[PDB]
Design a protein around this ligand. Sequence first.
Ligand SMILES: C[C@H](CCC(=O)NCC(=O)O)[C@H]1CC[C@H]2[C@@H]3[C@H](O)C[C@@H]4C[C@H](O)CC[C@]4(C)[C@H]3C[C@H](O)[C@]12C
Length: 127
Amino acid sequence: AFTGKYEIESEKNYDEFMKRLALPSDAIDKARNLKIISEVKQDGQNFTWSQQYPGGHSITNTFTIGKECDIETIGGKKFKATVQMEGGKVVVNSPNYHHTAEIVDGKLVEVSTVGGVSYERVSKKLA
Ligand SMILES: C[C@H](CCC(=O)NCC(=O)O)[C@H]1CC[C@H]2[C@@H]3[C@H](O)C[C@@H]4C[C@H](O)CC[C@]4(C)[C@H]3C[C@H](O)[C@]12C
């Protein structure tokens, strides 16, 4: 809380979210019932998040709270995003995209929200 190596507790909306993001087939297949691992090194107000992915890909992200950050690659755009703490939860916010990151039970709860879909995640800290 916030820092740690978290494993996925569960997910329930990923496949349809990927189509709204415009991610490829070689991402929608290779998440099909993996134990994804959320790594979270906090630097202070800065963060070094990762969603590691035992299927031959992975997604790191360094960011800062109370700022915009630049974001590339994930479906072939070059976005900026506002990056923030909502009340107790961390959050990324950008055009056609909200993504909170709340704590409960010592675990992370994420909720992503895109054009016409949401995608919650529950990621347990247990290492
Ligand atoms: C900014 C882009 C989305 C931009 C976009 O394509 N919007 C239009 C659209 O959806 O059509 C999002 C999509 C997936 C996000 C990542 C995933 O949710 C996983 C992970 C979640 C963490 O809370 C913050 C870091 C990050 C790597 C996230 C960084 C960033 O928040 C990403 C890379």
